[PDB]
Amino acid sequence: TFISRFAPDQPRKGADILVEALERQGVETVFAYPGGASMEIHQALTRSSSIRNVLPRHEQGGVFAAEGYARSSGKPGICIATSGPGATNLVSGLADALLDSVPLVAITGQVPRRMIGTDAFQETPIVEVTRSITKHNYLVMDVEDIPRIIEEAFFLATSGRPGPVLVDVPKDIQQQLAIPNWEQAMRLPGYMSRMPKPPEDSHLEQIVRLISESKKPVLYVGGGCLNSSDELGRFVELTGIPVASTLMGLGSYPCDDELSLHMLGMHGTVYANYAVEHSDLLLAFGVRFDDRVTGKLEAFASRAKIVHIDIDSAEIGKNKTPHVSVCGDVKLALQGMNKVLENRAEELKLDFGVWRNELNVQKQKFPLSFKTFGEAIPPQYAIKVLDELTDGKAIISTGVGQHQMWAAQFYNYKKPRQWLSSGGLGAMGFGLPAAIGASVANPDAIVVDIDGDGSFIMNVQELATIRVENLPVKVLLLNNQHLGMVMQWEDRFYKANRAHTFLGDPAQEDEIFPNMLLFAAACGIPAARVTKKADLREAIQTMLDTPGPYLLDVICPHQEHVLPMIPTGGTFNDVITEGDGR
Amino acid sequence: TFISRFAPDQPRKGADILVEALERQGVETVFAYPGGASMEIHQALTRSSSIRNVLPRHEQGGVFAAEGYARSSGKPGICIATSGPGATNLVSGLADALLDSVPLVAITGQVPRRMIGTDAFQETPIVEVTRSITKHNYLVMDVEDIPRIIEEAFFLATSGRPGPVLVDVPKDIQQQLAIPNWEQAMRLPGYMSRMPKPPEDSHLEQIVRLISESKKPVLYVGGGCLNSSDELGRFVELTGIPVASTLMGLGSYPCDDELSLHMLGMHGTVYANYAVEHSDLLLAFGVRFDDRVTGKLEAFASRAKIVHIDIDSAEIGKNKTPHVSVCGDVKLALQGMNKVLENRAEELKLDFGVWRNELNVQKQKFPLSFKTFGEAIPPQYAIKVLDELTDGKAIISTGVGQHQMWAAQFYNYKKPRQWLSSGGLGAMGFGLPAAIGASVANPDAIVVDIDGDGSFIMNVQELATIRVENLPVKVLLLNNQHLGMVMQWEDRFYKANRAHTFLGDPAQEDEIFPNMLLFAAACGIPAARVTKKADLREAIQTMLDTPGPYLLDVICPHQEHVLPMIPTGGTFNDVITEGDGR
Numbered sequence A, B: 001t002f003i004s005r006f007a008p009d010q011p012r013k014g015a016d017i018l019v020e021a022l023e024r025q026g027v028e029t030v031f032a033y034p035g036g037a038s039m040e041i042h043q044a045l046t047r048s049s050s051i052r053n054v055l056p057r058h059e060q061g062g063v064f065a066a067e068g069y070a071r072s073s074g075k076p077g078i079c080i081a082t083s084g085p086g087a088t089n090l091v092s093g094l095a096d097a098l099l100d101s102v103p104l105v106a107i108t109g110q111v112p113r114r115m116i117g118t119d120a121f122q123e124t125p126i127v128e129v130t131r132s133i134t135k136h137n138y139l140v141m142d143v144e145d146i147p148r149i150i151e152e153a154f155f156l157a158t159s160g161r162p163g164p165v166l167v168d169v170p171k172d173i174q175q176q177l178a179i180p181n182w183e184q185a186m187r188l189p190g191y192m193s194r195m196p197k198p199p200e201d202s203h204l205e206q207i208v209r210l211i212s213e214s215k216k217p218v219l220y221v222g223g224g225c226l227n228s229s230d231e232l233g234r235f236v237e238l239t240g241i242p243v244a245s246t247l248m249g250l251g252s253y254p255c256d257d258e259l260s261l262h263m264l265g266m267h268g269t270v271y272a273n274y275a276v277e278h279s280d281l282l283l284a285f286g287v288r289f290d291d292r293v294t295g296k297l298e299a300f301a302s303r304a305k306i307v308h309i310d311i312d313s314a315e316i317g318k319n320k321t322p323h324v325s326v327c328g329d330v331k332l333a334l335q336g337m338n339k340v341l342e343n344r345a346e347e348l349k350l351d352f353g354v355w356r357n358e359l360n361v362q363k364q365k366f367p368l369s370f371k372t373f374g375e376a377i378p379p380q381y382a383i384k385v386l387d388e389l390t391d392g393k394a395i396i397s398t399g400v401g402q403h404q405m406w407a408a409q410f411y412n413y414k415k416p417r418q419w420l421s422s423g424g425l426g427a428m429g430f431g432l433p434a435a436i437g438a439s440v441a442n443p444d445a446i447v448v449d450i451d452g453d454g455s456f457i458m459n460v461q462e463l464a465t466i467r468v469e470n471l472p473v474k475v476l477l478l479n480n481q482h483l484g485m486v487m488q489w490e491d492r493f494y495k496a497n498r499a500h501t502f503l504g505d506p507a508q509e510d511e512i513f514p515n516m517l518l519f520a521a522a523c524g525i526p527a528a529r530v531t532k533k534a535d536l537r538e539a540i541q542t543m544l545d546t547p548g549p550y551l552l553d554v555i556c557p558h559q560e561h562v563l564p565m566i567p568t569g570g571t572f573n574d575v576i577t578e579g580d581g582r
C-alpha cells in the first residue's frame, strides 16, 4: 500500500504529481540537472524522502549514469534535464540506450504550452528530435495525463524489447494544481495486443528435435539473455553445446567455464568464429545478427540450420532467414526446453564430445595472445591482473576503443550485468558515468571503469560527481596517448598515415599528456601512475584496497593491436591473427 | 439549455456521444456515407431527431456538398465517411476547403485501435494522409476525448482563418459505453494565445491618413470579406474608392454598382487590372495575393502603398511586403475606420472623382465583350439571361473551366455567399454537389449549377441525390463538347494541337456526346436542350418555373475563348483582349 505525502482530496502541483508518479513506480535514484524549465521538478524532488538525486556535471553524464544504473540492475534508469540545451545533451544517451535495448525513462522540461513553436527561450522540439532515437516519447499537454503517461513510459521502457522513453513536460503543467487519478488505464491497445505470448510446445519440441539430429551445434547468445543466466546454464548442462557470446551477452554464460567459446565476431576469438563457421545448428538466443558478428551474411553460418529466438518480431528474419523461429521471451523458451530435455534425456542421448574436441583443438592452437615487450605494460595483461585481484566479481564499465575490446577478451565475467559497455552505438565517454550509475545501484560492489585516454577525458567532469557522492569508483585508465582503435585501422588499411589520432602534446612528444593524475587531484580523488610491468600488480592492488574513488593511470605502448580482427565485410577465411604497428 | 436524449448518469455508446456532440454544436445537416467502420455513427444518427443526413452517391460528392453548405451559409459543413476508401474519397474536398478557407468538419471511421498499423481491412492512415491538406486533424484514442475533440474541431474550423478539420474515430471507441463530460476545457493554449486581437486605433488612423494623402486608391477585396458586406459598403460610401474583387470575393461589393470594377486578375476586367497597375494606394482587404491576381509580383501595383489587412499573420508579407499592415478581422477593421471617416469627414474632404473618371474612361473603352455567331448560343449571353430572369438573387455554384469564368464575369452578385466556386484548388466536379449543400442550407433560394460538360459528368451520380432529397437544384450546363479551358491554352500556346481535350465521340463527331438529358432522365429529373439563341430565353425561364430539379443542356460553340487573359507570369502590358479558335 503506497503512502502519499498529500491527501487524496488535496490539490498539488503537477511537478509533485510527477515525483509521486515516480515513487509509485519504485524509483529510488534519479540523475537530474536543474534548469529554468525543470525547477519545479527539482523543488518537488527535495520534498521526496525516498528519491535520491545524483547531480551530474553534464546531462550526457546524467543519461549515461542512468544507463549504467539500468545495465547493472535490470531496473529502469531515470534521468531528468531541462529544456533546450539540457535536453539536447541527452541525445547521445537516448540513441545509445535504443541500440542496446536499455530500459530508460528520460524526463525533460519544456517551455509553457502557449510558447511552444514560438522560438522561445531555451526551446527545442525535443520530441521531434528524439522520435527516431527513442522507443517512444510523449508531450504532456494536460496535468491530468501525468499519472497515465508516466505509467505508460515505464511500461514501454521495461516490457518487451527494452528501450528509452522520453517524457516532455511543459513548465505550466508542472505548476498547475490538480488532484491526480492513479487508477487510469493505460492507452496502449495495439502494443499490448502485439506483445509476445508464452512459447508453444510445438515450436519447442521442434527445436529439441533439431538438437538431436545435429552433430555440430553452437549457441549464439546475446544481450537478450541478461535475465536468463540460470535458465541458460541449465540448458547447457542438458545439451553440452558450446556457448559463444556477443559483446552484449558477455557474462550470460561464464567465460571461465570449459564449455565457453568466449566472444565471437570481428574481435572475437578464433575458435568461436570457427565454431559458427563449421556448425550445422545455430541456436541464436537473444541476438540481432549484427554485422560485427556476421560480417558477410552470405558466409556467416553457411552450413547451419538457424534457430532464432527473439522477443522482437522485427528482428526475426531481418538480416538472415532462420529455419525455426520462436517469437517471445528467451527466458520462457529455455524453461520449456529444459523440461523436455530432462524427461526425454535418456531417449535423446545427447553427446557432442566429438564436436567439442574439434573446438578444443582450435582453442589450443589459436588462443587469445598478447606479446610482452620488456618492462612495458601490456594492456591485455593489466586487465588479466584486475580479473585475478577481483576474483572476476567486479562490475566493469568501459569506453569505446581498443581498451573496450581487451576488457571484453581478458576478463572472465561470471554473471550478466557485470559488463556495461556501449556496443550498438559505441559512444565514447560512456565508461566513467556508467560506473557512477552502477556504483549507486550496487553500493557494496567493486565498480571499475576500464577507460581509454580519449574516452575518459570526454566526460572527465563526472569525477566531481564521484567525489561529491562519495562513490567507490575505480578507474583503470589504459593510457596509450592515442585514439587507439582509429590508429589501428590507420596502420592496417591506410599505411600508418596518422590523421589526428595522437592525443598528446606534439611539443613534448614523450610526455604523458594530459596529466590525468591532476584531473583526479582536482576533484580530490587519490590517483597514481604505473609504467613498469613489475609494479603493475601492486598498483592495481592499491587501487582496490584504497577506500573510495581511485584512478590508476596505466601507461601502455600505443603500437598494440586488438587481435584477432576480421575486416569489415570479410569472412572467417579473412581473419587477421598476428601483427601490430612496429 | 440543451436537452439530451440520455440521462446525465446513463452510459451510452461513443457513437451516441459523437452525435450529441454535433447536436450541441448546432449541427442540423450532415453528409454521411455508411461503411463498416462508421456503422455505429449511422445508427446513432437515426436516433437523432434534429440532425438530418443527406446520403450522397460518392464521398467526394459528400464533402463537396459540405462545402456548398458552408460557403452559402457561413456555418461549418459536416461530412462523414467510413475508413479506407470512404476516407480517401474526401481528399479532394479537404484540400479544396483548405485553399479556399472553408469551415469544414470531416468525421471518418477507423479500424479499432488494436488493429491500427496492421494493414487491416479497409485501413488507411488518413491522419498521416490529410495532415498537409487540413487545418488540423485528430485520432480519437479514448471515448472520453470525444466531447473535447469535437469542440476543438468546430472551434478550429470556424475561428480565425477557417479550414477543414478531420476527426478519425476508431470503431471500438464508437461502441464503448461511457458517460460524457460536456464541461471539459479545450486544450488549445498556443492557438488561442496567437488569435488576432481587435485592431488598435493607431493602425487604423494611419490607414485613414494614407487615404487622404492618396490620389488613385483601389480596393482589393477578397474572400476574407464574406462577412463584411455591410461594413465594406459603408466604407465605400465614406471614401468613394472603386472596388476590385477576387474570384473568392465576388458579391462582397455588388457588381452592378457604379463603383464596382468587377473581378481582377488573369481573367479579370481590363479596367480592374488598369486601376491596380496605376494606383498609389492599394487597400488589400481579405486577400492572399495569389499569382492569379498579381502575375509577375515585381510589376503588380508597382506604384502603390500597399495596405494589407488579414486575419492570418503568415499571409502578411508572404508574396509582397506592404507599407501598413493590420493583423485581425477585416470586419472590425472596417468598423473602426468607418467611425474615423464619419467624424473626420469634413476634415478630410475625400474626393476621388478625377481618379474614378480615369477608370470610367477605361471601363467604356475596354468592357467585357462577347461575339454572337449567327444563331449559336454565346455562353456569356446565356449566363447574362440567367442574371436577368433571376434578378441576380440566385445562388450560383460552378465547376472549373471556361464556364466558371463566364459565370463570374457575366453575373452580378448582390451579396456574398451567392458565389460558390473552387478557386484555390480549382477542383472539377464541384458545381453539382455544392449546389446540393447550398439548396439544403437555403431551401427557399434559387440554386443554379453553371457547370461544364467535363466537370458535370465527374460527379453526375449526385443527380440521384438531388431527386431522392427533392432539391430544387437547377443545372445550367454550358456544353461545348470539350475541356474548354485546356482547349483554350492549346490554341494560344500550342498551335491548337488537341491533346485529349475533346469529350465527345469521334465516330459521331457532330453528335452531342454524352446525351446529358438521359442522365437527368435516369434520375427522374426533367431536362431539355436548347441550341438556338432565340429559344434560349424561354428555355431558361422554363427551368426556373418548373418546380424541383431541372437540367438545361445549353449547346455552345467550342471555339470561344475567355477574355481578357493575362498569360502566366505576365504583366498588365501583356493582356490579351481579342481572339479565339477560328
Ligand SMILES: Cc1cc2nc3c(=O)[nH]c(=O)nc-3n(C[C@H](O)[C@H](O)[C@H](O)COP(=O)(O)OP(=O)(O)OC[C@H]3O[C@@H](n4cnc5c(N)ncnc54)[C@H](O)[C@@H]3O)c2cc1C
Pocket (backbone or CB within 6 Å): A099, A100, A101, A160, A161, A162, A221, A222, A223, A224, A225, A245, A246, A247, A248, A249, A263, A264, A265, A266, A267, A268, A285, A286, A287, A288, A289, A290, A292, A293, A309, A310, A311, A312, A315, A328, A329, A330, A331, A400, A401, A404, A422, A423, A424, A425, A426, A427, A485
Ligand atoms: C569498437 C566495437 C567493436 C565491437 N566488436 C564486436 C565484436 O567483435 N563482437 C560482438 O559480438 N560485438 C561487437 N560490437 C558490439 C556490437 O556492435 C553489437 O552491440 C553486438 O554485435 C550485437 O549485440 P546482440 O547480438 O547481443 O544484440 P542486442 O543489441 O544485445 O539486442 C538484444 C537482442 O535480443 C532480443 N531480446 C532482448 N530481450 C529479449 C528477451 N527477454 N527475450 C528474447 N529476446 C530478447 C532483442 O530483440 C534484440 O534483438 C562492437 C562494438 C564496438 C563499439
Ligand SMILES: Cc1cc2nc3c(=O)[nH]c(=O)nc-3n(C[C@H](O)[C@H](O)[C@H](O)COP(=O)(O)OP(=O)(O)OC[C@H]3O[C@@H](n4cnc5c(N)ncnc54)[C@H](O)[C@@H]3O)c2cc1C
Pocket (backbone or CB within 6 Å): B099, B100, B101, B160, B161, B162, B221, B222, B223, B224, B225, B245, B246, B247, B248, B249, B263, B264, B265, B266, B267, B268, B285, B286, B287, B288, B289, B290, B292, B293, B309, B310, B311, B312, B315, B328, B329, B330, B331, B400, B401, B404, B422, B423, B424, B425, B426, B427, B485
Ligand atoms: C480556372 C481558374 C481561374 C482563376 N482565375 C482567377 C482570376 O482571374 N482572378 C482571381 O481573383 N482569381 C482567379 N482564380 C481563383 C484563385 O486561384 C484564388 O482563389 C484567388 O485568386 C485568391 O482569392 P483571395 O485573394 O480572395 O484569397 P482567399 O483564398 O479567399 O483567402 C482569404 C484570405 O483573407 C483572409 N481572411 C479570411 N478571413 C478573414 C477575416 N475574417 N478577416 C480578415 N481576413 C480574412 C485569409 O487569411 C486569406 O489570406 C481562378 C481560379 C480558377 C480555378
Ligand SMILES: Cc1ncc(C[n+]2c([C@@](C)(O)OO)sc(CCOP(=O)(O)OP(=O)(O)O)c2C)c(N)n1
Pocket (backbone or CB within 6 Å): A399, A400, A401, A402, A403, A404, A426, A427, A428, A429, A451, A452, A453, A454, A455, A456, A478, A480, A482, A483, A484, A485, A486
Ligand atoms: C563519441 C565518439 N566519438 C568518436 C568515436 C569514433 N571512435 C571509435 C569507433 C570504434 O567508434 O570508431 O567508429 S574508437 C575511437 C578512439 C578511442 O579512443 P580511446 O579512448 O583512447 O580508446 P583506445 O583504447 O585508445 O582505442 C574513436 C575516436 C566514438 N566511438 N565515439
Ligand SMILES: Cc1ncc(C[n+]2c([C@@](C)(O)OO)sc(CCOP(=O)(O)OP(=O)(O)O)c2C)c(N)n1
Pocket (backbone or CB within 6 Å): B399, B400, B401, B402, B403, B404, B426, B427, B428, B429, B451, B452, B453, B454, B455, B456, B478, B480, B482, B483, B484, B485, B486
Ligand atoms: C478534377 C480536375 N481535373 C483536371 C483539372 C484541369 N482542368 C482545368 C484547370 C483550369 O484546372 O487546369 O489547371 S479546367 C479543365 C477542363 C474543364 O472542363 P469543362 O467542365 O468542360 O469546363 P469548360 O467550360 O468547357 O472549360 C481541366 C481538365 C481540374 N481543374 N480539375
Ligand SMILES: COc1cc(OC)nc(NC(=O)NS(=O)(=O)N(C)S(C)(=O)=O)n1
Pocket (backbone or CB within 6 Å): A035, A036, A037, A038, A039, A083, A110, A111, A112, A115, A120, A121, A122, A171
Ligand atoms: C533559472 O534560470 C532562469 C533564467 C531565466 O532567464 C534569465 N529565466 C528563467 N525562467 C524562465 O525562463 N521561465 S519561462 O519563461 O516559463 N521559460 C521560457 S522556461 C520553461 O523556464 O524555459 N530561469
Ligand SMILES: COc1cc(OC)nc(NC(=O)NS(=O)(=O)N(C)S(C)(=O)=O)n1
Pocket (backbone or CB within 6 Å): B035, B036, B037, B038, B039, B083, B110, B111, B112, B115, B120, B121, B122, B171
Ligand atoms: C458492413 O460491411 C462489412 C463488411 C465486412 O467484411 C465483409 N466487415 C464489416 N465489419 C468490420 O469489418 N468490423 S472490424 O473488423 O472492426 N473492421 C476492421 S472495420 C472498423 O469495420 O473496418 N462490415
Ligand SMILES: [Mg+2]
Pocket (backbone or CB within 6 Å): A313, A314, A315, A316, A317, A318
Ligand atoms: Mg519476420
Ligand SMILES: [Mg+2]
Pocket (backbone or CB within 6 Å): A401, A452, A453, A454, A478, A479, A480, A481, A482, A483, A484
Ligand atoms: Mg587511447
Ligand SMILES: [Mg+2]
Pocket (backbone or CB within 6 Å): B313, B314, B315, B316, B317, B318
Ligand atoms: Mg509577416
Ligand SMILES: [Mg+2]
Pocket (backbone or CB within 6 Å): B058, B457, B458, B459, B460, B461
Ligand atoms: Mg464519379
Ligand SMILES: [Mg+2]
Pocket (backbone or CB within 6 Å): B401, B452, B453, B454, B478, B479, B480, B481, B482, B483, B484
Ligand atoms: Mg466543356
